[PDB]
């Protein structure tokens, strides 16, 4: 079986270096090209450079330039991807993967793949969520339904998770996914559909648990004036 | 150098599907299902590499490479990319519809009082229940585009198999008040859905 076989993931601070693992087996590892593509959460496929494994030469795209080395150890079938000065956007999956199989002459595309390695980089530490209130009104307010909801704002680690009146509300809630901001920190929010009718007779809290903080809030959500 | 691929193509078991790349012979399309690697389908426009499926197939008109696959089957669902030499398209998902299209539902939420009163401000933009599971999302103060600022999650599964994201526009509270209205716009299946909401004291 031609297959190459990645280091298990990893996870860095910004500023440090990473090293991934490639190890060839069931073809002749010093015949073909080694390649390294990379994958951010969510997005496409990018080159990022090749290495020659009888020669030692490298290729790297331009993206990377100063800050990949590409080696590789014949003795033991294998080729290194270090990336250094790492930044929170080389947050990735990491593939090595080369052409060992086709009938083409130009060493792309790759037929080979190793499973990838995740690297996360992030300079965030531990922090519990903010919390605030989206008031339902007029405005979210459809089939005589108001949605209203909790913004639970710049927390780390995940996982946040969100009920609503202590787990006596299913109905119609519908809780996002975070998004990861920028500054390393996550956001979430929750929503529930409820009876127009009801605001102002019914309270409506969300439950918000961040157990990597020990943290729980209890927001109540009224609706504007 | 610049491999352009539409964002979602979709199309019903048994149906047939093409998926063209647009750039400027060594086009190359692979498929990729979550949490694996990248699986090289077609290489140089047509070549199928051993095992490939005979219902994959690959063409090539002027600038513009297509792969068709014939015969859709439910494992087909997936992202594929085209590829030239080192360069790759930014990706298609494929949706093997398994149940009726459906346009996003979009909630668009203000800044909270009490985020303001914190000198922050947050829109909140939650899009639901849309199928299949692809949308671009901009946002505009007043009718002008706004790119600063903006976060965007990827599409998430819904209990009824429907998908989710959100997006979420951070402002300073004097750029959010000196605005007549601030608007979510959310694409999908190439038409739009905006949701707008407006400084209110």
């Known amino acids: 079986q031609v297959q190459l076989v990645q280091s298990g993931a990893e996870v860095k601070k910004p500023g440090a270096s990473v090293k991934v693992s490639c190890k060839a087996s069931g073809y002749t590892f010093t015949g073909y090209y080694m390649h390294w593509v990379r994958q951010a959460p969510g997005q496409g496929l990018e080159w990022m450079g090749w290495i020659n494994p009888n020669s030692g030469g490298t290729n790297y795209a331009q993206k990377f330039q100063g800050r990949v080395t590409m080696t590789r150890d014949t003795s033991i079938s294998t080729a290194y991807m270090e990336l250094s000065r790492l930044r929170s956007d080389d947050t990735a999956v990491y593939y090595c993967?080369?052409?060992?199989?086709?009938?083409?002459?130009?060493?792309?595309?790759?037929?080979?793949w190793g499973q990838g390695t995740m690297v996360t980089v992030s300079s965030a530490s531990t922090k519990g969520p903010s919390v605030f209130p989206l008031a339902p009104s007029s405005k979210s307010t459809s089939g005589g339904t108001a949605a209203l909801g909790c913004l639970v704002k710049d927390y780390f680690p995940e996982p946040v998770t969100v009920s609503w009146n202590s787990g006596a509300l299913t109905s119609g809630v519908h809780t996002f996914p975070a998004v990861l901001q920028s500054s390393g920190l996550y956001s979430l929010s929750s929503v529930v559909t409820v009876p127009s009718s009801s605001l102002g007779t019914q309270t409506y809290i969300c439950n918000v648990n961040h157990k990597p903080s020990n943290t729980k809030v209890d927001k109540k959500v009224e609706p504007k004036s | 150098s610049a491999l352009t691929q539409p964002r979602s193509v979709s199309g019903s078991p048994g149906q047939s599907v093409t998926i063209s790349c647009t750039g400027t012979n060594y086009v190359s399309w692979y498929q990729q299902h979550p949490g694996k690697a990248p699986k090289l389908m077609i290489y140089?426009?047509?070549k199928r590499p051993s095992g490939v499926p005979d219902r994959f197939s690959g063409s090539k008109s002027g600038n513009t490479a297509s792969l068709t696959i014939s015969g859709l089957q439910a494992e087909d669902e997936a992202d594929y990319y085209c590829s030239a030499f080192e360069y790759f398209g930014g990706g298609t998902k494929l949706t093997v519809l398994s149940q009726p299209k459906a346009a996003p539902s979009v909630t668009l939420f203000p800044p909270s009082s009490e985020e303001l009163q914190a000198n922050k401000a947050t829109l909140v933009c939650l899009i639901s229940d849309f199928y299949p599971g692809a949308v671009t999302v901009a946002w505009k103060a007043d009718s002008s585009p706004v790119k600063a600022g903006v976060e965007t999650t990827t599409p998430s599964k819904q209990s009824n198999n429907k998908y989710a994201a959100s997006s979420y526009l951070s402002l300073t509270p004097e750029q959010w008040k000196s605005h007549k209205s601030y608007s979510c716009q959310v694409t999908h299946e190439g038409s739009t859905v905006e949701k707008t909401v407006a400084p209110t004291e």
């Open positions: 993967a080369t052409q060992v199989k086709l009938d083409s002459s130009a060493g792309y595309p790759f037929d080979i």
């Open positions: 140089d426009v047509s």
